[PDB]
């Protein structure tokens, strides 16, 4: 009862990407904006994460680690949710001043990826996900990707993850009645969570390549963005950091 009150109170607010919606849609313009929105959205995730119960009792090193590995999956999941309640999953609502339409998806040279994220949005509708179920799932996403060897203090991490997995169970169970719909529901939500990883990986690779040849494509990468994508992302695409799926 108290847990849900927290996630709702610490839930970040609207964030603008600062895109010049008066300039012809181009690869450089759109991407440069997305990177900026990523920088702005990142600052809020850090604050949001700190407010997360138990997050503070995590080794400072792991705190910055988990954040640098799941920031992508978290932002996408939230974007899809916004796209679902803002445009009915019609388009991708990255930001109030950065709404992606069919045309912009192609102009971004990542139409296939946008198509996958859009499905995620539609998923929120088909499964009738509730704001409460969403809030918790997003929180669980924070502890859904860690290095293979483990964290500085894997002990506390597993304990926290276990508690959030239980919180998700509570939100569901504390509304149903029969022991049948409770399982099937937990199954669907856990499935929805894993479907985010594949999408995040494709975005990890795309942003990676973009960074490499960002000098010739005229795409600006903020400080934090370029540092995480050049140090953290590689570990993910190399196998160092692997997501934590519920199902095989």
């Amino acid at each position: 009862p108290i847990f849900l009150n927290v996630l709702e109170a610490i839930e970040p607010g609207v964030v603008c990407a600062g895109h010049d919606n008066n300039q012809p849609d181009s690869f450089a313009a759109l991407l440069s904006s997305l990177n900026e929105l990523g920088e702005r959205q990142l600052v809020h995730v850090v604050k949001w994460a700190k407010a997360l119960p138990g997050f503070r009792n995590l080794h400072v090193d792991d705190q910055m680690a988990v954040i640098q590995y799941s920031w992508m999956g978290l932002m996408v999941f939230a974007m899809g949710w916004r796209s679902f309640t803002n445009v009915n999953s019609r388009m991708l609502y990255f930001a109030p001043d950065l709404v992606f339409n069919e045309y912009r998806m192609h102009k971004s040279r990542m139409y296939s990826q946008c198509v996958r994220m859009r499905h995620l949005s539609q998923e929120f509708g088909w499964l009738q996900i509730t704001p409460q179920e969403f809030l918790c799932m997003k929180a669980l996403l924070l502890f859904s990707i860690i290095p293979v060897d483990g964290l500085k203090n894997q002990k506390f991490f597993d304990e926290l993850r276990m508690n959030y997995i239980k919180e998700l169970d509570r939100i569901i169970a504390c509304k149903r009645k029969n022991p049948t719909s409770c399982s099937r529901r937990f199954y669907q939500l856990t499935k929805l969570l894993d479907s985010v990883q594949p999408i995040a990986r494709e975005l990890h690779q795309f942003t990676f390549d973009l960074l490499i040849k960002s000098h010739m494509v005229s795409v600006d990468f903020p400080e934090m963005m370029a540092e995480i994508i050049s140090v953290q992302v590689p570990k993910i695409l190399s196998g160092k950091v692997k997501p934590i799926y519920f199902h095989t």
């Binding site: 990142l42 850090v46 705190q63 954040i67 400080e223 540092e227």
Partner: peptide, 10 residues
């Protein structure tokens, strides 16, 4: 400077 964000004060 993510650490800078990690340990701000207010």
């Amino acid at each position: 400077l993510l650490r800078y964000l990690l340990d701000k004060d207010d």
